[PDB]
Symmetry: C2
Subunit: 750 residues, 2 copies
């Protein structure tokens, strides 16, 4: 096997570890053994950080950030130097990864370390280009980062490289069980020219992670369990921190009747060790078409038998040691709790070694197909038609990566966009490149890592905007209205009474009664969500169709421009002509964009190309500001539906009658039913129900309630945006990003 002598020498040199703060190593503190899981031997003593340590790390990261942000070319040289040092010390990083985590040295040397190198090489260029190619963007500041134990060095690269490229500084904590390659990374920062405090590494358990998440940082980036991601969303709610989450979701692996069987089998067995912890991967949930399922399973079991289990330092080993006894117990207990299907294992579990395991013959609706999967374990079911495969694949709370196998050029490219996922690999699995973004939808989280697409989440606008202050509704005497001037709601292509039956009088600036506006409730929202569900076909329309609709809305608003200006003036006391003209312009800009927001083709040094496609988010609940009674609604609605989303807007609480006049515009413009729904009333009644709703994909709260909205969003981990949003400013291009998901499809290409 491979010599660990240089790794042991480094560990003996470093002695008991403190933390890497402000460019220097601190004294060892409250120490705990970190253990080689394959031998049980102590590798080093590592500290449990204190609150004082985290405070110090964030303070050092903050002190260093403005000088670091100033010169992108200088950052590029440092990122390049880090990649060169990962390459020069590649064998040391690889052995230390194996010693610390248990994975086969062949994977650490062939996969982990080369992809970490490439991540830094590639992201060096983004630092070089940031000033000129991203001129409207600026660094966020300090990033708190938390990563899991399955790919310790590679997870670190995925966090630190883009953060540094965009001029941020970092405080990162490796997983409690696997601190060593992060500590070696810290130890090479000086030689790479990382200025003191630009990188800070602290070690500890989940409590230390929580200290970082709640520290005075500008961004939290986390990879790990869905449950911890929910807690992080709750703990950061209302703080204005940027947040990205790469969570659970071991992916489906779809094998069609006309797949290259032997290649599909080999790709699955070669992924059994890889597909552990929270990582973008596919293979753990096997879906095989029923005509080939028996032959596929028979070939799979025999190929699983050829996997070699043993000493992870042996370059011929395929299945290493489980990372920790806690993880071994997890897998053991998962298998003990299952009574479904037929379990095949290639060897008897022994010591730290758990064998490749296949549980086949499950039903599509079986629970184990949908529950979290631990260890080197595959579960399989069959399907009859490609449509049933899609249905099974999408029948979970997750959506991260997926793999599709078919030799037919139509079938593979017709199934891939139907899978709910951030990544789809055609005729491969677990393909990764620094230029190709990856990340989740649904309960697999949000944000993307890698590529140009990954950079937005480590930046903010160069010029800050500020949301307008709330505006209290005007009051009035309370005299009855002898005319019929009570506005309704707009749900599912028709006007509807508020379920609660109440409406409030609306008064002008001097107390004149203007009319009445409905007070919507949670049942109204529920009806609007059902209407958006019935309008799912809108998310499959062509860009050309959606543009035509938005052009009609703009033209039909123009035809009533003076009427809308008069309504705005009635309500606010201020001339409305400029706001109406801006609203028309936002509609024509969204119409313009509807068929022009292009996906991006990534050249990769692997087989083929990666297509970073733009897709709708789905169903979006939106709360509009008081100010800009028309423009605020139109500015949020138009880019959203341009991108293929369906929306439910809570109009301006103070000034609802421009939105209700807008119902006729939507009707005259043939907006399909359910695509635009409008509620009026008190946002205190609606904000938490919209943010909580388990059947909304995103909530945009631009009228306040940010803490309540962001905390309630953790229920299904919907995307959330709470501003800033200034309707006077044209935010169209930025809202397009809020309104879309990136889905990266890896296809063959000569």
């Amino acid at each position: 096997p491979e010599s660990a002598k240089e790794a042991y020498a480094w560990l003996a040199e470093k002695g008991d570890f403190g933390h890497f703060i402000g460019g220097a190593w601190t004294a060892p503190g409250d120490l705990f053994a970190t253990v080689n899981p394959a031998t049980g031997q102590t590798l080093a003593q590592v500290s449990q950080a204190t609150q004082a340590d985290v405070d110090a790390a964030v303070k050092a990261a903050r002190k260093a950030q403005p000088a670091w942000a100033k010169d992108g070319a200088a950052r590029a040289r440092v990122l390049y130097a880090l990649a060169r040092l990962l390459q020069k010390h590649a064998r040391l990083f690889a052995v230390l990864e194996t010693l610390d985590n248990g994975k086969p040295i062949r994977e650490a040397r062939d996969i982990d370390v080369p992809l970490a190198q490439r991540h830094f090489y590639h992201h060096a260029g983004y630092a070089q280009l940031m000033g000129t190619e991203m001129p409207d963007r600026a660094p966020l500041g300090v990033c708190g980062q938390v990563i899991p134990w399955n790919f310790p060095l590679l997870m670190l690269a995925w966090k630190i490289a883009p953060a540094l490229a965009m001029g941020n500084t970092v405080v990162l904590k490796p997983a409690e069980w696997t601190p060593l390659t992060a500590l070696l990374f810290a130890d090479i920062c000086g030689q790479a020219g990382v200025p003191a405090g630009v990188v800070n590494i602290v070690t500890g358990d989940g409590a230390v992670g929580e200290m970082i998440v709640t520290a005075q940082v500008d961004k939290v980036a986390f990879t790990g369990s869905t449950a911890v991601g929910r807690r992080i969303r709750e703990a950061t709610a209302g703080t204005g921190k940027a947040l990205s989450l790469e969570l659970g979701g071991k992916g489906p692996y779809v094998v069609c009747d006309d797949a290259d069987i032997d290649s599909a089998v080999e790709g699955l067995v070669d992924a059994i060790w890889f597909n552990q912890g929270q990582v973008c991967c596919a293979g753990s949930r096997l879906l095989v078409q029923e005509g080939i399922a028996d032959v596929f399973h028979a070939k799979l079991r025999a190929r699983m038998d050829s996997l070699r289990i043993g000493d992870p330092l042996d370059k011929c080993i395929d299945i290493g040691a489980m990372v920790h006894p806690d993880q071994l117990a997890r897998v053991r207990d998962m298998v003990a709790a299952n009574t479904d299907g037929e379990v095949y294992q290639t060897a008897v579990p022994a010591g730290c070694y758990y064998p490749p395991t296949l549980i086949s013959g499950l039903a599509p609706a079986s629970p184990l197909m949908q529950q979290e999967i631990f260890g080197p374990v595959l579960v399989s079911t069959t399907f009859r038609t490609p449509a049933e495969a899609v249905e099974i694949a999408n029948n979970t709370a997750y959506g991260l990566a997926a793999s599709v196998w078919s030799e037919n050029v139509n079938l593979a490219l017709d199934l891939a966009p139907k899978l709910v996922a951030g990544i789809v690999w055609i005729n491969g699995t677990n393909m990764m490149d620094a230029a190709a973004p990856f990340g989740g939808v649904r309960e697999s989280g949000f944000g993307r890592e890698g590529g140009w697409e990954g950079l937005a989440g480590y930046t903010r606008p160069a010029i800050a905007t500020k949301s307008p202050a709330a505006v209290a509704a005007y009051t009035g005497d309370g005299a009855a209205d002898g005319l019929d001037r009570t506005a309704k709601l707009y749900i599912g292509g028709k006007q509807t009474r508020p379920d609660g039956g109440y409406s409030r009088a609306v008064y002008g600036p001097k107390g004149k009664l203007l009319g009445h506006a409905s007070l919507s409730n949670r049942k109204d929202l529920r009806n609007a969500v059902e209407a958006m569900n019935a309008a799912s076909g809108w998310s499959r329309t062509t860009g050309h169709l959606r543009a035509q609709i938005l052009y009609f809305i703009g033209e039909n608003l123009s035809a009533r421009a003076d009427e809308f200006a008069n309504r705005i003036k009635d309500m606010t006391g201020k001339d409305g002509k400029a706001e109406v003209a801006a609203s028309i312009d936002r509609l024509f800009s969204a119409a313009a964009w509807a068929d022009k927001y292009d996906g991006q083709v990534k050249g990769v040094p692997l087989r083929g190309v990666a297509l970073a496609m733009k897709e709708p988010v789905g169903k979006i609940g939106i709360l509009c500001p008081d100010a800009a009674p028309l423009l605020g609604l139109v500015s949020l609605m138009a880019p959203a539906i341009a991108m293929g989303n369906r929306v439910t807007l809570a109009a301006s609480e103070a000034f609802p009658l421009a939105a209700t006049d807008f119902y006729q515009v939507l009707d005259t413009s043939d907006v399909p039913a359910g695509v635009v729904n409008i509620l009026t009333g008190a946002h205190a009644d609606l904000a938490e129900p919209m943010a909580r709703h388990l059947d909304l994909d995103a909530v945009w709260g631009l009228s306040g309630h940010a803490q309540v909205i962001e905390a309630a969003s953790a229920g299904n981990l919907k995307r959330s945006w709470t501003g800033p949003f200034d309707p006077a400013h044209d935010h169209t291009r930025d809202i397009l990003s809020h309104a879309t998901e990136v889905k990266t499809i890896w296809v063959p290409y000569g």
Copy 2:
């Protein structure tokens, strides 16, 4: 058949036609009948424009342009109004197209008019977004445009829509044989709100086209024969006009053994009428794998028999009238001159009707496979392996569109990037959309029409740059050099003596002898081109590899930074440190870009998606300015090779010794042989040979000689760029566009 009554009424209303100039119709002038080719009847009298008319049209276009350029949102409303009027009058446009050109009314109604509408609908949005999404760009000014007879209305849309979107005005001449839909287009401009003079239509023969090409316009855009494109390149040489050319090249149609045979057959027969004149198309050159060739041909001949020939006003007709007796004679003579293969025709030629014709059994090296093809005629050959198919497909002077048929997901996507073409359709042909760019390489021309990609050619930089003035070499006494200080050339990875044997003394600003520099000749250039041919593998490398090489060049220049600054100062008398630092920065910016210049995915309202990929231009000859002895060379070389090109640079004529010091940098950085070649000497000796060379794909002349360079480039219609180029300015992103071709691959997608 379809009623022509409304079309005849319009023609009777318009009477004898003058031209549409300055928003108004001019008096009829020197009149000639335009004739219905299916009936021989005169449709209308149409004028042959005078030089006075063209002058007036350009003067009106110029007068209107600045107001038109000012408000992009206003232009978007006009472009949208034009699309609505094309849609409202769709049936009139379609019948008039059939009457004037001879094509079946079903094609005019189903294909021509709907795509013209969509082109205007879609490009309206680019006008709306131009200010904010293209802030560094501004209108060119006035565009002279010339279009052919095969798709009169659609060709007009492809020219006028992007020109107007980007704030230009137009003078367009329809084909002599088919003026009528352009005249109806003129007649609807008023109703659409086109400001007077923004659109000008003049009619006439090729002499009128030549008047427009040589008029005081900022841009010439032409679609037509390759021979006329050469003449247009010669007549515009040295004028500073922008130029785009969509030329000949009926495309290859590759049918693999595992193609969907019946679909491939049906796509070919449905394209027989379409594939006429100079248009982006495929089907005319059929390449069928030998295992299925007999069955394919047998099915093809019978499907050809089902095509209905006759009255083009009959909606059941598939094969209409030939456009003009001159075109009928062309096809007849082409068939009479051929002695190869086996000719099958579905009917006897009669009157204006020529039957679908298949000439099969040709050899791959047969001439008719490579000669221009006229009429509804297909020619076919067979191939054995996919590699032979590529070889046959690429064995012409053209490169426009191509089609590939295979049910295998690997094969189709592995063949498409190997075909020399601007457009490749997988399992389809002649697929068109306003968002998907199309255009040629090689002798099929240059520039792209459609999409974001088509807009650059109708704009220029918002801030103009200016090339530095030439600098005379310093002189000196003429004393012999007792040390060995004679620099060589750098060709094919090694230093080489100039073939001519001569070198000139190089002197500093005060007459000190600094050394000697070789005087390169045409044989040296020939050797450099052969070296670039041997380095063709560089154009197939990964972006990651090319980045690594460029990073090495930058680091190795940095290691000699003071030495290069001293050399620059020796030669120019001015401190060189800032120029060296800029040169290093250009190398690191090109390294950054090497794996980040992404292709664009187009959503189309047709089957699938269009991938607008970035590809290398190939081999580029570059002449550097006198000024910036190092920076000018490095600034041009680095983005070029970053994009996968191989280059031969003529270094600064006045100050060659920094480029010759750079040879060691290229050697130390492991630049593969032939990828960078450097010539020194007199650009009067090299400019015309580089621009003429039939084995260079592009010539960049940034030291003058623009007229000679641009005229000689017409030999093989290589791309050319003659500036402006200011080395003090960072042009990197712009040079990336000079250094790449767009290739649009249409793939299935769910």
